[PDB]
């Protein structure tokens, strides 16, 4: 069960290469895509070694790197181009699907703010649901005329992408100043790659459960509407030490309210006996609020750090506070609507996202059902 | 040989030292969780109004010393001790309006003085002598006697065996004032009770058998 | 010393060999009987100077006019520790005793879980039907195809796993089993008895791994069906019935990867061989207890959640439209039984159930039931 | 349940470092934060080893010490600079507070004599804002200076959960009397001894007093009277110690009566003679208490650091502390009529007048109302 990855837009093509140079480094893979001498299951991302990538000016910058053998700005303008290269790119996609044994999902890296992303990323999600109906489409989208590109795209991600992880540049640029002291794009991307890498740790190493993308998402998303997640990377030592740093909003890249379900990923060699002791004290302290309506639990998983390269940690959070970020955007959208062929598609898009923010604000009530 | 392997380890002596240590630090965190039930919930807490029967596992080489009817007495003093830690901690965790504070010091003192008496003057006096005695054990039998002469005396100094409804109940009923006053956070009707039961306590204990005077000052 | 027994009349007290107690001598303790059977099986399965010295010691005992039990063990305990030390070398250093144990944890204890989800995906239709005399080999080619399907290639240790089907003495999964042909040196430690209790665990762990998989497929079926008012009642029960199994499937890495962490420690500390024979025997005994298998009530309650969920996931997959022709009339039957079983297990919980209840009630939802 | 330390200004960073020197000297922890081989529960004051220290020009001096492995002059000036780095420092607190399993208290070492007094004023109002269930104890140090001092009092009068006075003048007296010095680097040698011995019952577990709230709330009768003074005579039975403690030559403070006395005994004394010593203290009556509330004297036994002789410490709540306030108070009225709103200074003068007027009434037979 392999996952074909697609990368669109400048931001998407840039983070992917930094995600690729990170992944092949964790394994014994030379930049020439050849194994070096120097158990780790490597089939999920590599084909027999070539990564199952489809990259879509910046391409020249990639081929000039020593990793060469590894393989306008308006929403309307980006879409029009898509329909014109409709047939051209799908043969690239289709041939990769038939080549794989049992294709499972579609990882996509794109930015709503990015024009090409706001035009070409949006078009694929409708076509991907049309051609292949039984394939999950999960995207590592990243939030930043600017509000327009954002809200118009959110209209597609709420009905096409059955999963999504948001990465806000505002909080990322903030974290860069306080604990990294940078002031560029070339520095903040270093931490972005760390998130995507540890996000797919349990899949690349043989474990007991979590052997597919479905094995991670299904516990998080209960309903087709509540399909937005958040990440948190603490190390920038026991099992109880790492969790107390996760729940602090000082490290989560975000700018009543309660979670839905938590997934914890530990990449260290900690003694797995005291993890049940850590959870007990957490329930005693009551550090995070939950939903009363439905049964939920806090989960944790273990794995092994790359030996060829100490405890790290990544958390997957499903919080209703993420709705506020939408409101801020849609608020600015209404601000530009009253100041400036049909101008109607942008009207229905504002209405459908109203349901999403409504669903989350109604989710934090004891009567979210019906 | 048995006594030899009992200092550590069939170290019977080493096992005995741990016994009176895991009750009578560590047990502070254990009870504090109970302040804020289930029978399995406690176990994971431990492994981390008057019930909580506690037991232990003893190997055959020391089974003859720490008998079965010996566990209950060790359990008896543990139950009563917690109720003292309870009232002591309940009136401590918090921090005619200010008139309540005068009822605090007038009370937080009294329970505190009693706690200073049971633990230090009794649960540490005989304990210091008992260790100095067992280290000179020279017999299978007399080791039982020096031990049995440690419980049956510590159950007497700590008044729990007899004269319960005559003396012990007084400390018990005034302990209910530590519960009632803790929740509320009628006021005049408390000192009328408090100044009565406390005077009832001294005017009853005044009969002092002699070691009771170490607390009779207050 | 040579891996064969010279008996033709049921004389010796050793008859996959076993041990006999109703014919065992009186003064000889059962402990040393466990030592003997291990050293013999470990050589039979195995098929320099450590040979002649053991012979003369055995002969010297025959000249003693008094059989002293304190001396009988004095020579056997060296032989046990002798073959165990060399076997531990082969099990770890050349074969990555420790190396064999790692292979066991993988295939018996579902350590390589990714292999068994693709194995189920292929060997699914050829097992739901009642098993017959041909499905025994019809699946072995699927399992062999599965190991090559995840680019795990080794001509060693692959032909040592031969799936068996208990036929003629019912679904196919109820009779599935996995046997392992032990080598000679490890035969003293791996009797058909200890390999039997391993086999029982493999059936129960494979069952819950099967129901979670097909259940996750139902999750992908609701998500696929994004655009009926009663259509929401599925996921309101599916996601409900998902947490009862997923969390049941947790605590397993917290009981396997923890107990296994102790057994792997007990060997690298003690130089004695008797410690291995008792620690490993103690290690397996916990799996029967901690995994809630021996305790009938917890074993009889969650047992109903398994086959109840089968009907549910099949019902939603057996149609392509909404549950209209008595389908919704059928869904309302299980929820009347399942939701009661949810509170029923809540009463069973209220030694180790805290490690299970802590995860189940960290969100304090079952407090409302 | 742990306690986090914070060192402010040149003074606070000086007194804390030397206290961390001796504390690491008492414990079996080498200067390089690595355990030495050579019974003590140290999780409260150490993290696995790095101290839970929050230091705030002298930073260079701390780094230059071989212990590098162990991690204007206006009050309004400090207040402004604190808001500037509000989130700058509180992230360090929050990463450690949430980084601590169960935080218990907040100890503060600061001098109200320039910027640390202003920054310290900022922390108190801020710490009460966010953390409502966290103890705040301040080991403030006493001696244009009257202004900075009186403001910190106004903040300390209602924010801090407790307070321990340490006046330099009385400390200056001990510097010459029993040491014959006339130095800053020498007076703190006693301050560290005062600090280390104060929390000995928490670092070496005993039967009583296993939490800091267990020690203080026995003294403080009401949250207004939350000011304490200490005593340390040893520079011999249990009776010899306490009598040496009540002599005003040793009290670190430059009608009247006590409120409650808590004593620390760290020697190898016998618990057979302590209850009789209290009697001779009462019969001979070397001290008086409040006439309203029945006051008691407490004393605790402890264990001296084996890695390091009978010593002892005394904590007191004495109403004679009112005189110390009245001096700076008089000094304020002195410069007020002697020389953008200048109105907050009057608000501080009003509240500190209340506390003093309560002291004088606290020692009367009619403290009620
Ligand atoms: N995180 C991240 N975001 C990026 C990067 N490069 C561009 N972006 C985002 O892309 C947006 C600009 O889009 P742009 O690149 O002009 O779109 P294009 O002209 O269609 O490529 C900005 O708001 C950025 O937040 C990157 O390297 N990392
Ligand atoms: N007793 C004592 N007092 C000190 C020490 N260091 C500084 N002080 C006092 O602290 C006051 C000056 O504090 P200051 O350095 O201005 O603090 P800052 O403004 O925050 O840097 C002086 O009045 C000193 O009496 C010390 O080591 N011992």
Along the chain, the helix and strand elements of chain C come as: HHHHHHHEEHHHHHHH
- Estimate percent helicity of chain A: 40-55%
Spatial strand arrangement across the major sheet of chain C: 1-2
Sketch the major β-sheet of chain C.
2 strands, antiparallel
Subcellular location (chain A): Cytoplasm, Cytoskeleton, Microtubule organizing center, Centrosome; Cytoplasm, Cytoskeleton, Spindle
Binding site for GTP (chain A): 113-119
GO molecular function (chain A): GTP binding; identical protein binding; microtubule nucleator activity; structural constituent of cytoskeleton
Modified residues (Phosphoserine) (chain A): 102
Description of the structure:
The structure is cut from a larger assembly and holds two copies of chain A, one copy of chain B (218 residues) and one copy of chain C (369 residues). Chain A is built from 14 helices and eleven strands. Chain A is an alpha/beta fold. In chain A, the strands form three sheets. In chain A, strands 4-1-5-6-7 form a five-stranded parallel β-sheet. In chain A, helix 1 packs across helix 8 (185-199) and helix 6 crosses helix 14 (345-361). The longest helix of chain A has 18 residues, at 9-26. Chain A is globular. The two termini of chain A are 37 Å apart. Chain B is globular and about 70 Å long. Chain B has helices spanning 4-7, 12-19, 27-35, 39-47, 60-63, 68-93, 99-122, 125-134, 140-157, 164-183, 188-205, 213-216. Chain C is mainly α. Helix content of chain C is 61%, strand content 3%. Chain C has a two-stranded antiparallel ribbon with strand order 1-2. The radius of gyration of chain C is 25 Å and the shape is elongated. Classes of the chains: A alpha/beta (370), B mainly alpha (218), C mainly alpha (369). Chains in contact: A-B, A-C, A-D, B-C, B-D. The interface between B and C is small, with 5 and 8 residues. The complex binds guanosine-5'-diphosphate (2 copies). Residues 9-11, 14-15, 73, 111, 113-116, 142, 144, 169, 185, 189, 192 of chain A line the site of one guanosine-5'-diphosphate.
């Amino acid at each position: 069960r392999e996952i074909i990855t697609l990368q669109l837009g400048q931001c998407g093509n840039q983070i992917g290469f930094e995600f690729w140079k990170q992944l092949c480094a964790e394994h014994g893979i030379s930049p020439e895509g050849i194994v070096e001498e120097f158990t780790d299951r490597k089939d999920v991302f590599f084909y027999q070694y070539i990564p199952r990538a489809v990259l879509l000016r910046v391409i020249h910058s990639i081929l000039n790197s020593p990793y060469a053998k590894l393989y306008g700005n308006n929403w309307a303008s980006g879409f029009s181009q898509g329909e014109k290269i409709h047939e051209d790119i799908f043969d690239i996609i289709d041939r990769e699907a038939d080549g794989s044994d049992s294709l499972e999902g579609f990882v996509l890296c794109h930015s709503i703010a990015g024009g090409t992303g706001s035009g070409l990323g949006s078009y694929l999600l409708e076509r991907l649901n049309d051609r292949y109906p039984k394939k999950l489409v999960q995207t590592y989208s990243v939030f930043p005329v600017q509000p327009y590109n954002s809200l118009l795209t959110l209209k597609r991600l709420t009905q096409n992408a059955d999963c999504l992880v948001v990465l806000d540049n505002t909080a990322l640029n903030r974290i860069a100043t306080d604990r990294l002291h940078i002031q560029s794009f070339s520095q903040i991307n270093q931490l972005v790659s760390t998130i995507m890498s540890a996000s797919t740790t349990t899949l690349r190493y043989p474990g007991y459960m979590n052997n597919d993308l479905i094995g991670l998402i299904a516990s998080l998303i209960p309903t087709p509407r509540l399909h937005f997640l958040m990440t948190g990377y603490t190390p920038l030592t026991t099992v109880l030490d790492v969790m107390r740093r996760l729940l602090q909003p000082k490290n989560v890249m975000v700018s009543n309210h309660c979670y839905i379900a938590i997934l914890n990923i530990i990449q260290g060699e900690v003694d797995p006996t005291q993890v049940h002791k850590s959870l007990q004290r957490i329930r005693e302290r009551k550090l995070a609020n939950f939903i009363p309506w439905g049964p939920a639990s806090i989960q944790v998983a273990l794995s092994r750090k790359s030996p060829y390269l100490r405890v790290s940690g990544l958390m997957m959070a499903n919080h209703t506070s993420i709705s506020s970020l939408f409101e801020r955007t849609c608020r600015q959208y209404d601000k530009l609507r009253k100041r400036e062929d049909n101008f109607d598609e942008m009207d229905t898009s504002r209405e459908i996202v109203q349901q999403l923010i409504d669903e989350y604000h109604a989710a934090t009530r004891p009567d979210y059902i019906s | 040989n048995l006594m030899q392997t009992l200092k550590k380890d069939y170290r019977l002596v080493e096992y005995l030292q741990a016994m009176r240590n895991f009750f009578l630090d560590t047990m502070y965190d254990f009870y504090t969780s109970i302040f804020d039930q289930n029978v399995s919930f406690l176990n994971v807490q431990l492994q981390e109004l008057d019930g909580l029967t506690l037991s232990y596992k003893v190997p055959w080489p020391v089974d003859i010393v720490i008998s079965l009817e010996c566990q209950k007495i060790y359990n008896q003093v543990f139950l009563l001790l917690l109720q003292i830690k309870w009232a002591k901690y309940s009136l401590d965790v918090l921090l005619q309006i200010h008139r309540m504070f005068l009822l605090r010091v007038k009370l937080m003192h009294f329970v505190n003085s009693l706690h200073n008496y049971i633990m230090t003057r009794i649960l540490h006096s005989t304990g210091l002598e008992f260790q100095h005695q067992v280290e000179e054990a020279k017999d299978l039998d007399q080791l039982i006697k020096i031990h049995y002469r440690y419980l049956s005396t510590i159950h007497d100094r700590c008044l729990l065996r007899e004269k319960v409804s005559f003396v012990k109940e007084a400390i018990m009923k005034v302990l209910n004032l530590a519960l009632m006053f803790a929740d509320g956070w009628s006021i005049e009707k408390m000192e009328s009770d408090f100044k009565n039961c406390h005077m009832f306590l001294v005017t009853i204990l005044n009969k002092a058998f002699p070691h009771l005077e170490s607390l009779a000052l207050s | 010393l040579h891996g064969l027994l010279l008996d033709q009349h049921e004389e010796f007290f050793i008859k996959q060999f076993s041990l006999r107690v109703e014919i065992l001598p009186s003064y000889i303790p059962v402990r040393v009987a466990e030592k003997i059977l291990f050293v013999g099986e470990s050589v039979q399965m195995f098929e320099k100077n450590q040979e002649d010295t053991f012979a003369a010691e055995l002969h010297r005992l025959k000249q003693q006019p008094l059989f002293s039990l304190v001396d009988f063990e004095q020579v056997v305990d060296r032989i046990r520790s002798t073959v165990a030390e060399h076997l531990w070398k082969l099990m770890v250093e050349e074969s990555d005793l420790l190396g064999q144990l790692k292979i066991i944890k993988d295939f018996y204890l579902l350590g390589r879980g990714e292999l068994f989800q693709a194995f189920i995906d292929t060997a699914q239709h050829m097992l739901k039907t009642p098993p017959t005399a041909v499905t025994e080999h019809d699946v072995n080619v699927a399992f062999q195809q599965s190991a090559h399907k995840v680019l795990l290639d080794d001509d060693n240790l692959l032909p040592l796993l031969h799936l068996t089907i208990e036929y003629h003495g019912a679904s196919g999964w109820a009779a599935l089993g996995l046997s392992y042909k032990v080598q000679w040196p490890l035969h003293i430690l791996f009797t058909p008895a200890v390999l039997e209790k391993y086999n029982v665990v493999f059936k129960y762990l494979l069952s819950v791994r099967r129901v979670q998989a097909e259940l996750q497929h139902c999750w992908a079926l609701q998500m696929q069906r994004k655009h009926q008012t009663d259509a929401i009642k599925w996921r309101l029960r599916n996601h409900m019935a998902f947490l009862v199994d997923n969390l049941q499937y947790y605590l397993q890495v917290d009981v396997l990867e923890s107990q296994f962490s102790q057994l792997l420690h007990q060997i690298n500390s003690t130089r004695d061989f008797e410690s291995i024979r008792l620690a490993h025997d103690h290690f397996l005994s916990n799996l029967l207890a901690q995994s809630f298998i021996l305790l009938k009530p917890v074993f009889h309650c969650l047992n109903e959640i398994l086959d109840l969920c089968h009907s549910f996931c099949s019902l939603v997959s057996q149609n392509l439209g909404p549950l209209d022709e008595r389908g919704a009339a059928q869904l309302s039957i299980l929820v009347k039984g399942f939701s009661r079983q949810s509170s029923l297990l809540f009463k069973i919980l209220s030694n180790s159930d805290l490690a299970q209840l802590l995860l189940r009630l960290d969100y304090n939802k079952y407090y409302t039931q």
